[PDB]
Design a protein around this motif. Structure first.
Motif, PDB file in Angstrom:
ATOM      1  N   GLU A 135     -10.069 -12.109  14.863  1.00  0.00           N
ATOM      2  CA  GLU A 135     -10.942 -12.335  13.633  1.00  0.00           C
ATOM      3  C   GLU A 135     -11.955 -13.469  13.816  1.00  0.00           C
ATOM      4  O   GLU A 135     -12.977 -13.532  13.001  1.00  0.00           O
TER       5      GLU A 135
ATOM      6  N   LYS B 169     -13.100 -39.872  16.335  1.00  0.00           N
ATOM      7  CA  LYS B 169     -12.571 -39.828  15.107  1.00  0.00           C
ATOM      8  C   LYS B 169     -12.424 -41.263  14.960  1.00  0.00           C
ATOM      9  O   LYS B 169     -11.562 -41.818  15.270  1.00  0.00           O
TER      10      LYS B 169
ATOM     11  N   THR C 256      -3.987 -19.448  14.317  1.00  0.00           N
ATOM     12  CA  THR C 256      -3.178 -18.399  14.884  1.00  0.00           C
ATOM     13  C   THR C 256      -1.738 -18.498  14.050  1.00  0.00           C
ATOM     14  O   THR C 256      -1.349 -17.311  13.373  1.00  0.00           O
ATOM     15  N   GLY C 257      -1.090 -19.646  13.917  1.00  0.00           N
ATOM     16  CA  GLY C 257       0.157 -20.125  13.486  1.00  0.00           C
ATOM     17  C   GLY C 257       0.214 -19.664  11.823  1.00  0.00           C
ATOM     18  O   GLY C 257       1.160 -19.299  11.171  1.00  0.00           O
ATOM     19  N   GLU C 258      -0.787 -20.037  11.168  1.00  0.00           N
ATOM     20  CA  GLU C 258      -1.162 -19.706   9.890  1.00  0.00           C
ATOM     21  C   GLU C 258      -1.300 -18.229   9.308  1.00  0.00           C
ATOM     22  O   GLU C 258      -1.161 -18.022   8.298  1.00  0.00           O
TER      23      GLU C 258
ATOM     24  N   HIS D 240      -5.021 -22.579  17.921  1.00  0.00           N
ATOM     25  CA  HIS D 240      -3.315 -22.403  17.473  1.00  0.00           C
ATOM     26  C   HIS D 240      -3.023 -22.720  15.970  1.00  0.00           C
ATOM     27  O   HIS D 240      -2.172 -22.418  15.593  1.00  0.00           O
ATOM     28  N   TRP D 241      -3.787 -23.851  15.424  1.00  0.00           N
ATOM     29  CA  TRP D 241      -3.693 -24.242  14.115  1.00  0.00           C
ATOM     30  C   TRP D 241      -3.764 -22.845  13.214  1.00  0.00           C
ATOM     31  O   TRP D 241      -3.417 -22.938  11.964  1.00  0.00           O
TER      32      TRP D 241
ATOM     33  N   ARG E 120     -12.497 -21.413  25.638  1.00  0.00           N
ATOM     34  CA  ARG E 120     -10.873 -21.342  26.367  1.00  0.00           C
ATOM     35  C   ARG E 120      -9.970 -21.707  25.307  1.00  0.00           C
ATOM     36  O   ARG E 120      -8.950 -22.235  25.420  1.00  0.00           O
ATOM     37  N   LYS E 121     -10.446 -21.132  24.118  1.00  0.00           N
ATOM     38  CA  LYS E 121      -9.447 -21.203  22.943  1.00  0.00           C
ATOM     39  C   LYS E 121      -8.808 -22.636  22.729  1.00  0.00           C
ATOM     40  O   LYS E 121      -7.906 -22.830  23.135  1.00  0.00           O
ATOM     41  N   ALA E 122      -9.475 -23.495  21.981  1.00  0.00           N
ATOM     42  CA  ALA E 122      -9.194 -24.643  21.608  1.00  0.00           C
ATOM     43  C   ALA E 122      -8.289 -24.771  20.461  1.00  0.00           C
ATOM     44  O   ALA E 122      -7.040 -24.029  20.662  1.00  0.00           O
ATOM     45  N   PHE E 123      -8.368 -25.333  19.474  1.00  0.00           N
ATOM     46  CA  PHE E 123      -7.573 -25.758  18.315  1.00  0.00           C
ATOM     47  C   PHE E 123      -7.056 -24.599  17.629  1.00  0.00           C
ATOM     48  O   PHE E 123      -6.192 -24.500  16.543  1.00  0.00           O
TER      49      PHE E 123
ATOM     50  N   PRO F  79      -4.709 -29.939  21.012  1.00  0.00           N
ATOM     51  CA  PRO F  79      -5.720 -28.769  20.938  1.00  0.00           C
ATOM     52  C   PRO F  79      -4.911 -27.559  21.467  1.00  0.00           C
ATOM     53  O   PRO F  79      -5.097 -26.572  21.013  1.00  0.00           O
TER      54      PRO F  79
ATOM     55  N   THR G  14     -13.403 -34.045  11.326  1.00  0.00           N
ATOM     56  CA  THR G  14     -12.425 -32.986  12.140  1.00  0.00           C
ATOM     57  C   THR G  14     -13.195 -32.298  13.305  1.00  0.00           C
ATOM     58  O   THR G  14     -14.318 -31.899  13.291  1.00  0.00           O
ATOM     59  N   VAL G  15     -12.489 -32.194  14.333  1.00  0.00           N
ATOM     60  CA  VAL G  15     -12.793 -31.467  15.473  1.00  0.00           C
ATOM     61  C   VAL G  15     -12.996 -29.999  15.115  1.00  0.00           C
ATOM     62  O   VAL G  15     -13.719 -29.296  16.186  1.00  0.00           O
ATOM     63  N   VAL G  16     -12.444 -29.466  14.238  1.00  0.00           N
ATOM     64  CA  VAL G  16     -12.257 -28.273  13.723  1.00  0.00           C
ATOM     65  C   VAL G  16     -13.228 -27.636  12.973  1.00  0.00           C
ATOM     66  O   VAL G  16     -13.563 -26.473  12.630  1.00  0.00           O
TER      67      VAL G  16
ATOM     68  N   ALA H 191     -18.259 -23.127  22.088  1.00  0.00           N
ATOM     69  CA  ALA H 191     -17.920 -24.072  23.014  1.00  0.00           C
ATOM     70  C   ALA H 191     -16.356 -24.381  22.799  1.00  0.00           C
ATOM     71  O   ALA H 191     -15.837 -24.380  23.971  1.00  0.00           O
ATOM     72  N   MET H 192     -15.669 -24.076  21.910  1.00  0.00           N
ATOM     73  CA  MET H 192     -14.217 -24.131  21.515  1.00  0.00           C
ATOM     74  C   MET H 192     -13.296 -23.065  21.748  1.00  0.00           C
ATOM     75  O   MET H 192     -12.593 -22.977  22.730  1.00  0.00           O
TER      76      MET H 192
END
Ligand SMILES: Nc1nc2c(ncn2[C@@H]2O[C@H](COP(=O)(O)OP(=O)(O)OP(=O)(O)O)[C@@H](O)[C@H]2O)c(=O)[nH]1
Ligand SMILES: Nc1nc2c(ncn2[C@@H]2O[C@H](COP(=O)(O)OP(=O)(O)OP(=O)(O)O)[C@@H](O)[C@H]2O)c(=O)[nH]1
Ligand SMILES: Nc1nc2c(ncn2[C@@H]2O[C@H](COP(=O)(O)OP(=O)(O)O)[C@@H](O)[C@H]2O)c(=O)[nH]1
Ligand SMILES: Nc1nc2c(ncn2[C@@H]2O[C@H](COP(=O)(O)OP(=O)(O)O)[C@@H](O)[C@H]2O)c(=O)[nH]1
Ligand SMILES: [Mg+2]
Lengths: 428, 420, 124, 427, 419
Positions: B398, A342, B390-392, B387-388, B382-385, A251, B177-179, B378-379
């Motif tokens: 946004e 998962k 942000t990086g792209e 970063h996947w 506290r800013k969860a995933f 995460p 997928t969690v996302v 909910a994610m």
């Protein structure tokens, strides 16, 4: 698409040696390379007949890699992909990263790149190395820097062997661990730690091996490692590309470290006993005695879960199994997630090295979880490390290879920050 | 008068292919060839969905898009695989990622042109082009991600024509997928801005339908895609059959959408799996029988369109319909007068002697958005995933911009449980 | 009744008449405007030519994002490439002095033997 | 003298389509145009043999007009006089009047004008269109504007199809109705409304058609429409030319709307039954169940009446019949009129489309009355309209074609003023 | 990977020769030739200690240095004499003197080159050269004196490689030079500066072991050199056998020496003269069984390495070891964590079915230095035999410089009985 394994230094080499043998057993590839996409993700069809692994083996002494080019599997790899460096790393990161490292890193990187060249959509690297010990920590660190320069996006998954006193050589082990884990951190993507104590402990409770070999430990690791790659070696449900595989587990850019827990480890000779239920092996996963980094996750919280079943299995069961894991156990998920799980199923049953210690099983599981309990292994180290460094204990061996004393300071400064991070993902 | 079909991403194509091989049996088309069947009607509005090629041959008007080969070769080597024209396929090659940002920005905008290039030579080859319908998942990346960009690029090339989407709003149960909530929220935003109608298909609903009311123990993407294909063929019928009321795609839009934003139709079907008229109506108008997980009790209807199927005495049909919205009078909004039109077409679906399907623009749909939005905050809290993404190349705020846009949409659907 | 049918007209194929029955009881279309039919095209030719220049906006953002990831992966390299090559000319530079400071220590204790053997040939 | 029919958009086209077929049947003109002044007011004797109608058919989609040029009557009209526009009006007045309307109105007007050129004393136009629905409301409105520019005096009679829920497509129907009826008002002279519900209801009580077609409804309307024109087609006093309609029926420039009530509607198969008396069919006219805009005129007041009899009939009877209508009924005339009843007799018996639903009758009537009860149909609309608009319900579809939101405001403002007018003609 | 062996001075050569003929029987080498023995292991790491020459022949990698012929011809005409290559010998001819100064300056530097010339052509003939080990006495002159210079000249030619010394720190009982403390202090200084490990072998210890606990009435340099040869073969095993842990010399160093200065390993052996595992561990970890006279009670362990010998169930071995440092937990220093590694090699020594040996970096070693230094300031106080060195060209305060350097070393070992 493709996937290059890199094994650096004795531990890494020998772990590798023992899962390429298992990959070969899984995909029906005979030791000479010949076999009468798919598993193409890991092997390249070279010439007409053969099936060479997408791997490079690097050690700074000959010895270990030399044993590979001596005994069957001798003909598996190509002669070049096995690299050796004449002089040791002598059990210190400084030697490994700077002094003797320097010399061989240009040859390694330039050879890895030849494998990279034969990959129509290379996907990432799988680095296997020890935490303690010289070239394992030292040379790996330098590799991973230069890899992050030479291959931008391309993922990097690492299999670290976290050191444990009983089956261990060097006193300066902790320094080396903390030293690398720092330099390596912003260059790895997800990292699978393997606590040698746990692997040794599983061999003792489960296999009843009075005092296990390295090759005893290795065969077990081979299984845990196969279970992970499995997903993307055949084509099995989800975790089905290196991005998507880990998009699941991590995460936050830091927090790399998933806890691996392998299902039925049951000693050959017990093979002909009653086969264990899909519910019974699922339950095994939530039992610390079966873990793979000695810690305790009914203590910290889960921020990711991920059951990876192997062998004949139907979701109706895995679902119905998961139910009773929740009822009579510790859910314990952090604040801001789903309650994941998962599930991945791979119908292709688990194979075992025929002369080995464990029996042929009907169905296995792998439960990879990003739990904050792993942090415990980060302290057990840091504690050692502080308690020596507080006296410069062996520091002078590093300064001797031209390493700054403040580079110890600074790596420990990071290990604090990490231990901080991991504790700061609890409650909201 | 003539619509093209974009079908993008794994869920998109899997739905799409089954949809195609369902209507090609309704219309009566061979794996490759054309007509074989003693019915006559079919071919009148085959114009709408099949750009017909040399010889006899019919070839569906379809663009197949994906960001990696796998699930496309699936379709070619399968059911009615030999049916779509070769260079109407668009392989991605690269990572799809299960990452919206990748499909909408980096690895997506890589393809995009090659797609548009085929949507162009199909569309620029219509007598009078109605518009486009796209099918795709809303979580995950290649469909949800490139798709929203595709539609963002179509309106602009064709401001002009109207925009259709069967979109599968995703669920915790049956998902991978969690996302997904991130991917979905990011799209739901886009949809609100660039479509004229969206048929919300909840995978949550579907699953339930098979296990809540079907005894189906393990729901595949198989016996769950099936429900969508049936739902999709129902929803369309009037676009493709005798056709006086609705049926014209813009006409459907002018009639289904009171307010520019609220185009989220929740669909519903007759009998199920893989029937008397009253029972057919009490079923098609049931919570337990909607394609979106949300009971149209907690929320009223803005407009309904219902379409019946099979040689049946429709003296009973309007009679029945009329009753529904008297029995349940309070749940149809008072301020839009004759707001629930019905139509009948007498050519049955596969198997079934009798069937019906219903499109509802209901503020119960609010219920779905809230739940994908409650997952999302909910994610992102506290800013969860994150970063996947942000990086792209994406921006932090946004995500905050999409959430906020879609939170408005809840606050509007609510707003219009109003008063006379 | 009190009929009084006053017959207004007899015809070739007809006959009209009216039966007044009871007393009554009491006592610029402009061409101008299609400066309205093209003023309404003014409203559209505009508010459609906007949800198009709010789309050449949305586009100049793809161009923005797509080249940020490249501009900041480019950033990772030419920052953390030389974050290393100047962390290896600190090592090489360091240890070299450590070995050559251990020699100028050592020669100095050998130029001692040369300066205390010469102590024998001057004290016999 | 002459007389141009204009049929705009599906509803109008098809109503038209079904009364030109009846005009043909009345005047012995075979579908090819051949027949082995008078009915010259409506047909022109083009070349040697033929008899083409003075009509223009305009729709914005092909489809409907396309069907006309496919099936007999194919050769009735001239190819040009049938105009089609490729794209729809998609069910909204704004599109019709402004967006797609623009493009085709220069060809239509320019073509209508070719028929006008033929006419040595053109008398006016008969416009046939739907109230609800896109091009019916929208394109008519624009036509009627430009007609009032291009043909000054020349009268304009309209046949409006007032929408009814059961046989109807669009939800936004009311908007389109109110929108047009506003724009169209100061441009029409007299307007005959047709309540689809009434015409559907007559088909169900009278013809016993379980659930009527459009073509079912259309044939009935054809008859009511024929009954009105009859006067100008055969020539025989009482509405012999457009002007007289206005003269007899409308007392105030606004108040355009006469109520049509048609006589014996009796299902073929009953044909060989006893023929109904001149008294019995006159009585039919004063029975709401037989009306044509569903309202109730034993409620409002009559300010004009006008019995138009067809077939063999003698005044001695019509007179003597009218007597007993007064006695056992509701006279109910406003304050400041005679108690009218202009009677017209046309000896030429009613014809019927031979495959049709109603039987050949001996004698029919038509009773056209300007009653204040029609006002009810004006509310039933305004009520719908208000109740959507109060929320902007679908307004954005109009604003989208570049229409002012205040143009809704202002049309409803007029519909109020009308509903006011109509009530202010009592006592 | 490959170590050369400098063996200089009488006590150096006597120890060395016995060491050599002990490992050549462990490995299985003829007086001249090579292999004869049914074992198989041996030869894997014979690479390390035997630069192998033409034919079969094995020839030890050895340099034999002395400053006068006598004790070299001893070796040639004796045990495994025919084994070392001829011009690997270096005769001094002149006086050895029993005088450090002579061996380190005058009569020593006379030779030095001729020695370095053979250490070169041996070393410059290794595949990857590990380092050097030198054996020698610490009191007296040719070994103690030239040796320290030799090592002082090796580091410099090979800063690079690591430095090993079995040095025999001398005693009043069994010795006959009044000057030994001078000779010892002077060298102990040098050792601190130029080695990476030194195995402190006390002739005091040795003597005691034979008469304290062996009933040996008159201890020769004979039945006392014996103990050293056994100790030295023990200490080395891993350098020369299976290859589990240590075995690397640098590796041994990185593990045994916390602090640059404190490399003074005091050794200890299993059974003795010329056994159960527990008893083997209680003996190898005994004051009464150390190779350096200083009871590792008064002083703690910085690091231990222990190495066991013989086919024995090592389930019991770690178990045993673990117990040792629990039952005696306080004498292992807390701040260096896993500070006592162990290894096993299953090929026994001569005779003995079972054996063990232990290398201990202990601050008890402090005890030894103090006693040689208390002897030293006892003489230099009123300047005793000093004139023997003054005369050879040396400086007065250079003695004061050595004493002082070595007094610090006591003050450091003490310092690290810390917390
Ligand atoms: N699980 C496992 N751990 C090992 C193995 N070999 C060594 N280790 C561990 O690795 C650590 C030391 O690292 P090594 O790989 O041996 O050293 P290296 O620098 O990589 O290789 P060298 O050149 O031999 O020094 C210790 O913690 C050992 O416990 C092995 O084969 N399996
Ligand atoms: N009586 C009658 N009413 C009709 C007929 N066709 C349509 N309608 C009615 O007309 C209205 C719809 O008007 P349309 O003529 O279809 O609208 P349009 O835009 O003019 O026609 P299109 O070009 O097809 O869009 C509804 O109120 C229907 O109830 C018909 O044939 N007869
Ligand atoms: N109805 C249905 N839903 C699907 C299918 N495949 C994926 N989904 C849903 O769509 C979401 C992810 O879609 P996916 O196709 O992987 O995204 P893609 O990379 O754009 O193709 C998940 O929540 C799934 O539940 C399908 O086969 N049928
Ligand atoms: N262990 C042992 N010690 C010896 C032997 N010979 C001499 N020593 C000790 O070493 C010191 C002098 O050594 P020696 O070799 O004669 O000095 P050299 O002049 O360098 O050869 C004395 O203190 C003796 O105790 C020996 O053979 N074995
Ligand atoms: Mg190493």
């Amino acid at each position: 698409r493709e996937c290059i394994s890199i094994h650096v230094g004795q531990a890494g080499v020998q772990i590798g040696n023992a899962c390429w043998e298992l990959y070969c057993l899984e995909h029906g590839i005979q030791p000479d390379g010949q076999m009468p996409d798919s598993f193409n993700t890991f092997f390249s069809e070279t010439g007409a007949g053969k099936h060479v692994p997408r791997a490079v083996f690097v050690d700074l002494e000959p010895t270990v890699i030399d044993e590979v080019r001596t005994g069957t599997y001798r003909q598996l790899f190509h002669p070049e992909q096995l690299i050796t460096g004449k002089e040791d790393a002598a059990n210190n990161y400084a030697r490994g990263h700077y002094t003797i490292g320097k010399e061989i890193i240009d040859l390694v990187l330039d050879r890895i790149r030849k494998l990279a060249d034969q990959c129509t959509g290379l996907q990432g690297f799988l680095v296997f190395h020890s935490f303690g010990g010289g070239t394992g920590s030292g040379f790996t660190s330098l590799l991973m820097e230069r890899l992050s320069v030479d291959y931008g996006k391309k993922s990097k998954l690492e299999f670290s062997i976290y050191p444990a006193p009983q089956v261990s050589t060097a006193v300066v082990e902790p320094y080396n661990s903390i030293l690398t884990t720092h330099t390596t951190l912003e260059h790895s993507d997800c990292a699978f730690m393997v606590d040698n104590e746990a692997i040794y402990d599983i061999c003792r409770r489960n296999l009843d091996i009075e005092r296990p070999t390295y090759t005893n430990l290795n065969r077990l690791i081979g299984q845990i490692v196969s279970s992970i790659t499995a997903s993307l070696r055949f084509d099995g449900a989800l975790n089905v590309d290196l991005t998507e595989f880990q998009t699941n587990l991590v995460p936050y850019p830091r927090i790399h470290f998933p806890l691996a827990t392998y299902a039925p480890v049951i000693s050959a000779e017990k093979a002909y006993h009653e086969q264990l239920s899909v519910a019974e092996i699922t339950n095994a996963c939530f039992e610390p005695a079966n873990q793979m980094v000695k810690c305790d996750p009914r203590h910290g919280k889960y921020m990711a879960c991920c059951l990876l079943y192997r062998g004949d299995v139907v979701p109706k069961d895995v679902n119905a199994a998961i139910a009773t894991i929740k009822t009579k156990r510790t859910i314990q998920f952090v604040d801001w997630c789903p309650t994941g799980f998962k599930v991945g199923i791979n119908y292709q049953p688990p194979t075992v090295v025929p002369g080995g210690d464990l029996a042929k099983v009907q169905r296995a599981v792998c439960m990879l979880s990003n739990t904050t309990a792993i942090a415990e292994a980060w302290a057990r180290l840091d504690h050692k490390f502080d308690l020596m460094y507080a006296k410069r204990a062996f520091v002078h061996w590093y300064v001797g290879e031209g390493m700054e004393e403040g580079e110890f300071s600074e790596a420990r400064e990071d290990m604090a920050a990490l231990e901080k991070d991991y504790e700061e993902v609890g409650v909201d | 008068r003539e619509i093209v079909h974009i079908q993008a991403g794994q869920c998109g194509n899997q739905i799409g292919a089954k949809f195609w091989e369902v209507i090609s049996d309704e219309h009566g088309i061979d794996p490759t060839g054309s007509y074989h069947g003693d019915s006559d009607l079919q071919l009148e509005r085959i114009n709408v969905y099949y750009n017909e090629a040399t010889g006899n041959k019919y070839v569906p008007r379809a663009i197949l898009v994906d960001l990696e080969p796998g699930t496309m070769d699936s379709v070619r080597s399968g059911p009615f695989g030999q049916i779509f024209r070769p260079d109407n396929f668009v392989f991605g090659q690269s990572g799809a990622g299960n990452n919206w940002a990748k499909g909408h920005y980096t690895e997506g905008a890589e393809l995009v042109d090659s797609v548009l290039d085929v949507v162009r030579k199909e569309s620029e080859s219509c007598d009078c082009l109605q518009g486009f319908q796209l099918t795709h998942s809303l979580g995950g990346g290649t469909g949800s991600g490139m798709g929203t960009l595709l539609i963002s690029k179509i309106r602009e090339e064709y401001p002009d024509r109207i925009m259709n989407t069967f979109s599968v709003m995703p669920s915790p149960k049956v998902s991978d997928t969690v996302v997904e909530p991130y991917n979905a929220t990011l799209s739901v935003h886009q949809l609100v801005e660039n479509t004229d109608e969206t048929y919300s298909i909840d995978n949550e609903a579907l699953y339930d339908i098979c296990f809540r009311t079907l005894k189906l123990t393990t729901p595949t993407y198989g016996d769950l895609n099936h429900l969508v294909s049936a739902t999709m063929s129902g929803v369309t019928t009037c676009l493709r059959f005798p056709g006086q009321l609705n049926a014209d795609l813009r006409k459907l839009a002018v009639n289904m959408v009171p307010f520019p934003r609220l185009h989220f139709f929740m669909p519903g079907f007759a009998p199920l799996t893989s029937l008397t008229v009253p029972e057919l109506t009490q079923q098609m108008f049931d919570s337990k029988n909607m394609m979106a997980a949300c009971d149209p009790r907690h929320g009223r209807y803005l407009t309904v369109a219902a379409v019946f199927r099979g040689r049946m005495s429709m003296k009973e049909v309007d009679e029945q319909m009329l009753n529904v919205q008297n029995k349940n009078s309070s749940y149809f909004v008072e301020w839009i007068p004759n707001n629930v039109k019905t139509a009948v077409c007498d050519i049955p679906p596969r198997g079934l002697k009798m069937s019906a399907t219903f499109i509802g623009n209901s503020t119960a749909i609010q219920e779905l958005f809230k739940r994908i939005s409650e997952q999302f905050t909910a994610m992102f809290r506290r800013k969860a995933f994150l970063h996947w993404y942000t990086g792209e190349g994406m921006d932090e705020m946004e995500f905050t911009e999409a959430e906020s846009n879609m939170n408005d949409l809840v606050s509007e659907y609510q707003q219009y449980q109003d008063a006379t | 009744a009190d009929m009084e049918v006053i017959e207004l007209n007899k015809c070739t194929s007809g006959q009209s008449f009216e039966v007044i029955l009871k007393p009554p009881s009491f006592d610029p279309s402009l061409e101008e405007i299609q400066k309205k039919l093209e003023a309404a095209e003014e409203r559209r030719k505009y508010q459609e030519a906007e949800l198009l220049k709010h789309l050449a906006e949305k586009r100049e953002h793809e161009r923005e994002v797509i080249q940020k990831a490249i501009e900041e992966n480019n950033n990772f390299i030419k920052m953390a490439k030389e974050k290393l090559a100047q962390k290896m000319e600190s090592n090489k530079e360091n240890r070299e002095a450590h070995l050559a400071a251990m020699l100028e220590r050592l020669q100095e204790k050998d130029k001692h033997a040369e300066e205390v053997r010469k102590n024998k040939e001057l004290k016999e």
